[PDB]
Design a protein around this ligand. Sequence first.
Ligand SMILES: N#Cc1ccc(-c2cccc3ncnn23)cc1
Ligand SMILES: [Fe+2]
Length: 215
Amino acid sequence: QTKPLPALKLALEYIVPCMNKHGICVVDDFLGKETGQQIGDEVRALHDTGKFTDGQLVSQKDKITWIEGKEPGCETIGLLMSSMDDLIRHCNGKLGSYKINGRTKAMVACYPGNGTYVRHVDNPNGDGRCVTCIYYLNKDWDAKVSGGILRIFPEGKAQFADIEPKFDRLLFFWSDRRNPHEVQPAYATRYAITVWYFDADERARAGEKGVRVEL
Ligand SMILES: N#Cc1ccc(-c2cccc3ncnn23)cc1
Ligand SMILES: [Fe+2]
């Protein structure tokens, strides 16, 4: 007896108030089992064929790739991105005073899970990114056995959030200092896709994390 929520309804009746109140918003069953397993297979195919780069080489002074959405074998990742963009479009105007004029490409990541991430802020220095969006791909993830919980500590609140990296879960949170977060050790392989959305004013006033594409 079940139906998908129209994006406008999901954005305005849930995402906007959740974000404005808590700065964090979880949406389960975002795309359904079929589209989600297709994304998983595409992500796993990229990994098996050796298209990922060591993530420690990116950050220094996990394994990742950046997906635009139109590449061969990434069609459904492109659809995920379109569906995310639609939600943000229906929100835009009402997520704080942000006006979102773009986003990064999709960061597709494999986290091997062998006791691997410390508390950090995604955007500490006003790099322009205002909303972090993560989509998880781990079928039948059991956190008791496997770990890998994202813990978020909203700043100046007497509460925190424990987000399992669950299949077909879409997560939004403010990328700035409001949401320091850590990832507890994991003991199985994980896949996720992260996109960051840009506020126009902060972006204009400021690698691949600094590349704004249109929605
Ligand atoms: N599944 C899964 C999965 C695991 C770890 C992270 C990860 C790594 C490093 C920093 C960071 N910040 C927020 N998530 N996250 C993201 C997704
Ligand atoms: Fe993070």
